[PDB]
Amino acid sequence: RTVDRLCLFVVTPVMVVGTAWIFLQGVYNQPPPQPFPGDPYSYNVQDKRFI
Amino acid sequence: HFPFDEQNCSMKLGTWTYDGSVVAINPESDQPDLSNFMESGEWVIKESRGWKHSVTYSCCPDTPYLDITYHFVMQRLPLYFIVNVIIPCLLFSFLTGLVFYLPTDSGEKMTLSISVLLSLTVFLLVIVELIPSTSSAVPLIGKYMLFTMVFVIASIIITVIVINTHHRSPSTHVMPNWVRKVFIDTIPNIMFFSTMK
Amino acid sequence: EKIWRPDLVLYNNADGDFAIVKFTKVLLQYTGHITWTPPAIFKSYCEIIVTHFPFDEQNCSMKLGTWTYDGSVVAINPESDQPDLSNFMESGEWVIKESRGWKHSVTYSCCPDTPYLDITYHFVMQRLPLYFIVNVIIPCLLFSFLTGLVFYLPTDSGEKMTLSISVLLSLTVFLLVIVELIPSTSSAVPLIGKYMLFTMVFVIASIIITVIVINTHHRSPSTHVMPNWVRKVFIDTIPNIMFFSTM
Amino acid sequence: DALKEDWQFVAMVVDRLFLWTFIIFTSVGTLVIFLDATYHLPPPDPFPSR
Amino acid sequence: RITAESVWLPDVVLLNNNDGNFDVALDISVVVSSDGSVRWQPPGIYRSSCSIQVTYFPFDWQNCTMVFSSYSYDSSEVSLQTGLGGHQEIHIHEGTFIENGQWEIIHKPSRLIQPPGEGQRQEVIFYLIIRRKPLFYLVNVIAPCILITLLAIFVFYLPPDAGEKMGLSIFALLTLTVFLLLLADKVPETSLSVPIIIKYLMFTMVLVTFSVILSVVVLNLHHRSPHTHQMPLWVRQIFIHKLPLYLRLKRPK
Amino acid sequence: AVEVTYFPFDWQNCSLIFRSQTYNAEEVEFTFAVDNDGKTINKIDIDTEAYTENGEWAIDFCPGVIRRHHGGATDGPGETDVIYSLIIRRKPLFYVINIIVPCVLISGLVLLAYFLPAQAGGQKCTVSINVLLAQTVFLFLIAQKIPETSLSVPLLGRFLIFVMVVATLIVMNCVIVLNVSQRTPTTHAMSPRLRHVLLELLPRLL
Amino acid sequence: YFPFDWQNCSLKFSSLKYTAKEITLSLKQDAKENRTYPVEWIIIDPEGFTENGEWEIVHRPARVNVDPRAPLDSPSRQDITFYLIIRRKPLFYIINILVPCVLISFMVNLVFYLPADSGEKTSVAISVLLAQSVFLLLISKRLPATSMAIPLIGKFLLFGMVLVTMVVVICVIVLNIHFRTPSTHVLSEGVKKLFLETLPELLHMS
Ligand SMILES: *[C@@H]1O[C@H](CO)[C@@H](O[C@@H]2O[C@H](CO)[C@@H](O[C@@H]3O[C@H](CO[C@@H]4O[C@H](CO[C@H]5O[C@H](CO)[C@@H](O)[C@H](O)[C@@H]5O)[C@@H](O)[C@H](O)[C@@H]4O)[C@@H](O)[C@H](O[C@H]4O[C@H](CO)[C@@H](O)[C@H](O)[C@@H]4O)[C@@H]3O)[C@H](O)[C@H]2NC(C)=O)[C@H](O)[C@H]1NC(C)=O
Ligand SMILES: *[C@@H]1O[C@H](CO)[C@@H](O[C@@H]2O[C@H](CO)[C@@H](O[C@@H]3O[C@H](CO[C@H]4O[C@H](CO)[C@@H](O)[C@H](O[C@H]5O[C@H](CO)[C@@H](O)[C@H](O)[C@@H]5O)[C@@H]4O)[C@@H](O)[C@H](O[C@H]4O[C@H](CO)[C@@H](O)[C@H](O)[C@@H]4O)[C@@H]3O)[C@H](O)[C@H]2NC(C)=O)[C@H](O)[C@H]1NC(C)=O
Ligand SMILES: *[C@@H]1O[C@H](CO)[C@@H](O[C@@H]2O[C@H](CO)[C@@H](O[C@@H]3O[C@H](CO[C@H]4O[C@H](CO)[C@@H](O)[C@H](O)[C@@H]4O)[C@@H](O)[C@H](O[C@H]4O[C@H](CO)[C@@H](O)[C@H](O)[C@@H]4O)[C@@H]3O)[C@H](O)[C@H]2NC(C)=O)[C@H](O)[C@H]1NC(C)=O
Ligand SMILES: *[C@@H]1O[C@H](CO)[C@@H](O[C@@H]2O[C@H](CO)[C@@H](O[C@@H]3O[C@H](CO[C@H]4O[C@H](CO)[C@@H](O)[C@H](O)[C@@H]4O)[C@@H](O)[C@H](O[C@H]4O[C@H](CO)[C@@H](O)[C@H](O)[C@@H]4O)[C@@H]3O)[C@H](O)[C@H]2NC(C)=O)[C@H](O)[C@H]1NC(C)=O
Ligand SMILES: *[C@@H]1O[C@H](CO)[C@@H](O[C@@H]2O[C@H](CO)[C@@H](O[C@@H]3O[C@H](CO[C@H]4O[C@H](CO)[C@@H](O)[C@H](O)[C@@H]4O)[C@@H](O)[C@H](O[C@H]4O[C@H](CO)[C@@H](O)[C@H](O)[C@@H]4O)[C@@H]3O)[C@H](O)[C@H]2NC(C)=O)[C@H](O)[C@H]1NC(C)=O
Numbered sequence A: 001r002t003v004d005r006l007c008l009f010v011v012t013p014v015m016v017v018g019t020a021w022i023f024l025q026g027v028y029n030q031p032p033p034q035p036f037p038g039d040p041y042s043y044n045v046q047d048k049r050f051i
Numbered sequence B: 001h002f003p004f005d006e007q008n009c010s011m012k013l014g015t016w017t018y019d020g021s022v023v024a025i026n027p028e029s030d031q032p033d034l035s036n037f038m039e040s041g042e043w044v045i046k047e048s049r050g051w052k053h054s055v056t057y058s059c060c061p062d063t064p065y066l067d068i069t070y071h072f073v074m075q076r077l078p079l080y081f082i083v084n085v086i087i088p089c090l091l092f093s094f095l096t097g098l099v100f101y102l103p104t105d106s107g108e109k110m111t112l113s114i115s116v117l118l119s120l121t122v123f124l125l126v127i128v129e130l131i132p133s134t135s136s137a138v139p140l141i142g143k144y145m146l147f148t149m150v151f152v153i154a155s156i157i158i159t160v161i162v163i164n165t166h167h168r169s170p171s172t173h174v175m176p177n178w179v180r181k182v183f184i185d186t187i188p189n190i191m192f193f194s195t196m197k
Numbered sequence C: 001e002k003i004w005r006p007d008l009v010l011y012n013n014a015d016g017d018f019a020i021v022k023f024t025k026v027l028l029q030y031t032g033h034i035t036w037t038p039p040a041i042f043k044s045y046c047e048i049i050v051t052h053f054p055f056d057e058q059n060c061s062m063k064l065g066t067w068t069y070d071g072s073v074v075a076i077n078p079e080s081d082q083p084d085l086s087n088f089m090e091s092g093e094w095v096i097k098e099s100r101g102w103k104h105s106v107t108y109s110c111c112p113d114t115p116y117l118d119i120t121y122h123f124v125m126q127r128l129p130l131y132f133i134v135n136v137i138i139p140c141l142l143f144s145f146l147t148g149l150v151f152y153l154p155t156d157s158g159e160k161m162t163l164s165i166s167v168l169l170s171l172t173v174f175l176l177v178i179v180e181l182i183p184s185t186s187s188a189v190p191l192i193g194k195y196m197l198f199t200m201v202f203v204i205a206s207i208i209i210t211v212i213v214i215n216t217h218h219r220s221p222s223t224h225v226m227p228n229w230v231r232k233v234f235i236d237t238i239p240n241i242m243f244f245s246t247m
Numbered sequence D: 001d002a003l004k005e006d007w008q009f010v011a012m013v014v015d016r017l018f019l020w021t022f023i024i025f026t027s028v029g030t031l032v033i034f035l036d037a038t039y040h041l042p043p044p045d046p047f048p049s050r
Numbered sequence E: 001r002i003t004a005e006s007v008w009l010p011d012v013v014l015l016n017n018n019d020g021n022f023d024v025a026l027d028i029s030v031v032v033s034s035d036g037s038v039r040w041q042p043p044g045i046y047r048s049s050c051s052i053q054v055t056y057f058p059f060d061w062q063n064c065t066m067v068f069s070s071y072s073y074d075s076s077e078v079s080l081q082t083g084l085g086g087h088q089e090i091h092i093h094e095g096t097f098i099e100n101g102q103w104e105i106i107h108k109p110s111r112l113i114q115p116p117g118e119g120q121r122q123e124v125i126f127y128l129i130i131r132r133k134p135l136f137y138l139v140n141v142i143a144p145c146i147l148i149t150l151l152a153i154f155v156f157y158l159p160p161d162a163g164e165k166m167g168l169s170i171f172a173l174l175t176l177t178v179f180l181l182l183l184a185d186k187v188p189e190t191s192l193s194v195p196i197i198i199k200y201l202m203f204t205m206v207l208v209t210f211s212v213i214l215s216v217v218v219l220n221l222h223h224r225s226p227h228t229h230q231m232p233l234w235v236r237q238i239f240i241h242k243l244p245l246y247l248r249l250k251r252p253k
Numbered sequence F: 001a002v003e004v005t006y007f008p009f010d011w012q013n014c015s016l017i018f019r020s021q022t023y024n025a026e027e028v029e030f031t032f033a034v035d036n037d038g039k040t041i042n043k044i045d046i047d048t049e050a051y052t053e054n055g056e057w058a059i060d061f062c063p064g065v066i067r068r069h070h071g072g073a074t075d076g077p078g079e080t081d082v083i084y085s086l087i088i089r090r091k092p093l094f095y096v097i098n099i100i101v102p103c104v105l106i107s108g109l110v111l112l113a114y115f116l117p118a119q120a121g122g123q124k125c126t127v128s129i130n131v132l133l134a135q136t137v138f139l140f141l142i143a144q145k146i147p148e149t150s151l152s153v154p155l156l157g158r159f160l161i162f163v164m165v166v167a168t169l170i171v172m173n174c175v176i177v178l179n180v181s182q183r184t185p186t187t188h189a190m191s192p193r194l195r196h197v198l199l200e201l202l203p204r205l206l
Numbered sequence G: 001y002f003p004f005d006w007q008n009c010s011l012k013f014s015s016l017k018y019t020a021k022e023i024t025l026s027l028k029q030d031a032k033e034n035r036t037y038p039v040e041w042i043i044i045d046p047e048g049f050t051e052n053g054e055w056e057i058v059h060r061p062a063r064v065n066v067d068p069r070a071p072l073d074s075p076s077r078q079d080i081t082f083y084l085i086i087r088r089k090p091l092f093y094i095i096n097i098l099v100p101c102v103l104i105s106f107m108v109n110l111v112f113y114l115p116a117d118s119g120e121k122t123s124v125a126i127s128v129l130l131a132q133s134v135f136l137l138l139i140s141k142r143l144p145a146t147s148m149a150i151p152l153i154g155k156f157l158l159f160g161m162v163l164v165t166m167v168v169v170i171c172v173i174v175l176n177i178h179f180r181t182p183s184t185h186v187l188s189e190g191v192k193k194l195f196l197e198t199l200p201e202l203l204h205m206s
């Protein structure tokens, strides 16, 4: 029983932390604010580049 | 509301390269012709209708653009999904509660609950191939499926708690007084009472 | 496309092209001799006998003839007695044991003056069964072997039904594999099918007899009383043909 | 009980023997198959001498 | 620049196509120079026959050839040479190449095959030696098989009195059957050899089956009725006196 | 259109309708061809010697009929077509050998749970719930084969749902029998009415 | 990052019958307030466009690409590329795969609260492993077998399978410890001091 309780308090935090890490990489994955890295232009109809 | 969903499907038709000022299109009838329509085994056409539309953009004052849109309202025939999807889910949902009438000393509570969950997981194959893989909303089939899954898992958790409580002895635990009061004194008074205190 | 050609058609075409559709160039000699070697994908209907599958032999055929010309105006003759297999790519599933082309001429009663000709090329092929032996037969053999082990498992272990039912579950899950791999036809029962059904009935019989054995083991002395036929058969007579200590 | 304990001890000893035998057989077979896979390399030359 | 149908073309086709399509995807245009030189660069989507060496799948490499030749003209009429200006290789533009996510190109030569030994024809064969990148199978198949194998080992440390040996072993077997269902969608179906992944899977299945059998033997010994069964003296000697010392099992008292 | 009600023991009525795409019945009309004896061939012709039967479908009948319609005053020009009706019968051997027989046997296995002991090691619930799991596997298998219309329920699906309901009821029954068998006087009081019903009355009535 | 992934697809347009020497490709020019600007994006009718059921268009640029290294008479000199940066809407995968998979994986920690006398610990753990295997079978049909990366759901499933295998091994060790007896094992005073007095006091056990 004591071994079982120690394993409860060791394994379960490892499971929770590993799952949280793996899924937080994906949850905060988003396309970049600009289409092309290094190019500040947005290529949106609002930001017309008049000639 | 899948599988009891109602779908409005249109067919927009128009002259691709001619505008209204050179070619005009008009509907032959207010409704599509369904006289030679073959019966469908999955959908019932409740209503069908054709509407002509004319649009004039500001840049083009004098060239109206015409179209005829034929819309169909359709109701899914739900018998297939009722028979193949909903009824097994209902049977699993019913089997979920039966663990709480099983004695702990049988040594089969976890067998029953885990086997119900394994059946539900195998059923996931059927559901995902049959369910639509879209993210516009959650279907009723999906909501009921997730409900059944969640409550089988809840039954497993609470069953583990019940078994743990059942196996407690003075050599491991001491009975708290509030447990005595709540479970051994008050609650059984308002129950069957065929069980001896 | 510029010249007259014979309109050879695959009479037993199943769901492909009936005639040549790839119109490659003809080699014309000054003597008027034309050679035309078009390619084709032939999809031929053929009676498939699945009785000995996975060790089945299939004698398939390709009937060729001039669709709109009869033998009185256009005659077809085989170039050779056998199909040309000189540029044949090796198959990873079949071995062509035999191949041969035969010309046939048929005269119908309504048409005594227009014989109808054809050339039928047949190929006798044997399936290479290693894939089905490894993927299908060996797991079924292992399940069949595991079926009998339950009768060496003591009742007091409380695991007899676990073993038997779980073997049944493994075989049921494997049935998905078999249905994916083997073909699904009702002309006859394949040999894999017979073995699969034998294994399933074997496991079900094991489960039934195991339930009987468990019930016999747990027969209460209070409720039940031993019949004299059971005592004479099992406690008195049978163990003499075996080697274990009596009660 | 003494006879039962003798049978149980025999069962334990046989279990430990089978544990070590399974470890050895598993490791040897897995290593053989994995080394066969790992040392299968693409040809150094497009047209090897055969 | 002239439409290709307007000029004579050499009838160069992929001889070893698998779908019946011999020709290019779009005829486009030829570029004709004043000296009569004609350059033609038509696009093509080709499905060629490649005999798969299945022995080491998925840790395999393949040798897929594209055989190009004139379908009608013979060597006395049209002579072929590997194109160059002398790089006898498939050209891959480094910037614009769509790399495959499952295959790495090791070699990519080209060779002119002279006719064997008119009607005789040369060929230009472009070879692609490609190595599979097996990460998918390592993650989805091999690692679970290793884990199941470890559990099969650990069955023999489970005490008989727990009543759980059979459940563990046979559910490991059931899990392996699920993985057999997984592989059925992916493996080649030819019968010239057995893929090494299938060999490993059947090896693991045989191991788990033997774990089941030996667990049954151990349970039979453990639950053996003391009165109905008498220990033979050789069993006593070997398994109670000799073997325990070698296995480091000290019976208390 | 597949009539699913008795699948896989079903027969179908597949029509082949032929008509001129251009001309009306006044411009082109149809008659059936005649054999050598002059008998009208009002059916699909099949050369017996060259015919190989489909592996799953036997052609029982194939009549043909020339229909004429839309000759009314309002309708205007008449229309005609030729409809052939292939009445084809499924050969159900594949489904019998591979699906129905194993499913029937595995679904019959739940009846064995009534003969296992109602103790901790009887594994009554093991037998019942795992039969339900196997039936779920068969549901996955059958979903790959059945038609996907909703005019009626096929026989195969009806049988599978029926045996699933029976297995669920037997699971509930096994739970009840275990609950009754394992009652101890330290938890439960001896209900005399049910004891009289089960121990005294029922054996006499039986 | 699947199912929380975004993709970067492209549509590259050029001429194979003409080169930059013969035609010059440019982007369409629109006007506002008598000021011309280039249309540097994919046009989407705001009213008529129906969004894809799984993909949301985040960016949609357009570009003229000229390769300075290629000769002017090459077809590869010029092109116009229309890019679609599209974000997956992960609701379907969440509801139908990820929540059940995560919950089933996390249930395996319940075996540490089950007593060893229940006789059902390793069955629970190995069944969780089986369910994870079914989920892996499901995912394997939905993504390509590329080697550029392990998908996020694949990473979680591998991590959970490893953890469940570890839990099964731990359950085996715990059961082995639980079923020791004086006739088979010797319980040393050090083990008693560590596991019956020190650790339970540290862990706040009852
Ligand atoms: C396999 O599948 C085929 C094709 O579906 C089946 O053959 C068809 O079976 C139908 C019955 O189920 C047949 O329909 C009946 O025909 C009867 C014949 O009597 C004639 O009726 C004529 C009336 O006008 C006809 O033509 C006009 C054309 O515009 C049409 O609108 C009418 O509806 C009608 O078809 C008449 O001019 C002629 O002289 C004959 O008297 C007819 O009596 C039946 O009518 C009865 O049933 C209907 C039911 O709706 C009812 O309204 C009526 O009052 C009356 O009680 C049917 O119309 C159809 O003709 C067959 N088609 C063929 C043979 O080409 C076949 O049976 C199937 N095989 C199986 C299941 O084994
Ligand atoms: C697989 O399946 C194919 C069929 O799809 C099998 O092919 C058959 O092979 C056998 C040989 O093993 C063929 O028999 C031979 O046929 C030739 C040619 O026959 C034709 O020409 C004759 C004139 O030259 C003509 O008389 C024949 O017509 C006969 O039959 C029709 C009815 O079909 C009848 O109306 C006529 O009156 C005739 O009776 C026909 O047009 C023939 O020359 C051969 O004769 C030699 O061998 C036979 C052996 O029995 C011997 O008896 C003769 O005396 C002579 O020595 C022989 O009959 C058969 O025609 C092929 N069938 C085809 C291709 O349709 C193939 O064998 C199968 N393989 C295996 C291994 O199972
Ligand atoms: C989705 O996918 C598309 C591709 O399909 C991506 O588009 C690419 O975006 C990158 C980054 O913006 C582009 O790379 C950049 O190209 C510029 C132009 O190169 C041309 O011109 C130069 C001379 O000026 C030539 O030498 C060259 O050969 C080209 O002809 C460069 O100027 C940029 O340089 C910058 O980055 C480098 C990084 O090494 C630095 O060293 C430099 O100092 C400088 O900061 C850069 O190389 C690329 O060309 C685009 N591909 C196209 C248009 O096909 C999208 O960005 C992507 N979207 C995402 C991921 O959100
Ligand atoms: C499924 O989806 C389709 C669209 O794809 C919907 O179709 C729409 O149907 C409505 C009618 O139900 C269309 O609206 C219009 O109907 C008018 C009919 O007149 C009635 O209504 C008016 C207003 O209440 C009353 O005054 C009058 O007495 C009648 O009771 C037409 O007059 C409208 O025409 C106008 O617009 C067109 C377009 O520019 C002009 O050309 C006309 O000259 C006129 O100005 C109009 O047709 C609606 O337009 C339909 N939409 C489309 C795109 O077809 C279905 O209703 C929907 N089904 C469901 C969900 O049930
Ligand atoms: C992928 O697949 C391709 C083919 O699809 C393989 O290419 C073959 O590779 C082998 C070995 O490299 C080649 O075989 C060798 O060919 C040489 C040339 O043969 C030509 O010239 C002779 C002389 O005129 C003619 O008789 C012959 O018909 C050919 O026209 C031979 O000189 C070689 O012989 C030498 O080695 C053999 C070894 O057994 C000895 O017996 C000989 O005495 C001699 O020492 C040899 O036969 C074969 O031609 C290639 N086929 C082609 C190019 O189509 C690739 O190797 C393969 N790639 C990989 C890595 O798997």
Ligand SMILES: CC(C)CCC[C@@H](C)[C@H]1CC[C@H]2[C@@H]3CC=C4C[C@@H](O)CC[C@]4(C)[C@H]3CC[C@]12C
Pocket: A016, A019, A020, A023, A024, A027, G102
């Ligand atoms: C730890 C176990 C349950 C694994 C799953 C963890 C999930 C449910 C958690 C971990 C961190 C969470 C995110 C943390 C913060 C935010 C920002 C806020 O706008 C709510 C959504 C969002 C984006 C959460 C979504 C759910 C999330 C991804």
Ligand SMILES: CC(C)CCC[C@@H](C)[C@H]1CC[C@H]2[C@@H]3CC=C4C[C@@H](O)CC[C@]4(C)[C@H]3CC[C@]12C
Pocket: D026, D027, D028, D030, D031, D034, D035, D038, E146, E149, E150
């Ligand atoms: C269930 C377990 C005990 C069976 C497998 C155990 C042993 C034999 C396995 C586990 C991990 C394996 C290693 C994993 C990866 C590599 C790197 C490769 O480039 C060569 C082989 C090598 C070095 C493997 C050799 C065999 C190995 C050491």
Ligand SMILES: CC(C)CCC[C@@H](C)[C@H]1CC[C@H]2[C@@H]3CC=C4C[C@@H](O)CC[C@]4(C)[C@H]3CC[C@]12C
Pocket: C134, E192, E193, E194, E198, E199, E202, E203, E204, E206
């Ligand atoms: C691992 C053991 C214990 C059980 C599984 C046996 C497997 C590995 C056996 C069964 C049949 C065998 C194949 C039978 C014949 C051939 C053809 C030839 O090319 C030699 C190897 C090869 C391809 C064998 C490889 C190993 C094989 C696939």
Ligand SMILES: CC(C)CCC[C@@H](C)[C@H]1CC[C@H]2[C@@H]3CC=C4C[C@@H](O)CC[C@]4(C)[C@H]3CC[C@]12C
Pocket: B083, F151, F152, F153, F157, F158, F159, F161, F162, F165
């Ligand atoms: C739950 C148990 C008792 C029954 C299991 C079989 C189920 C699927 C059966 C029992 C009765 C059946 C229904 C009986 C009659 C009809 C009317 C018919 O026009 C369409 C099919 C329909 C609606 C059937 C559908 C399938 C059905 C619901």
Ligand SMILES: CC(C)CCC[C@@H](C)[C@H]1CC[C@H]2[C@@H]3CC=C4C[C@@H](O)CC[C@]4(C)[C@H]3CC[C@]12C
Pocket: A023, A027, G094, G098, G099, G102, G103
């Ligand atoms: C234990 C509970 C939380 C169930 C497990 C949830 C797991 C699967 C996590 C992993 C990633 C998570 C998602 C990541 C991002 C978001 C933020 C926002 O868009 C709503 C919730 C949503 C969509 C999360 C829902 C829960 C989620 C799917």
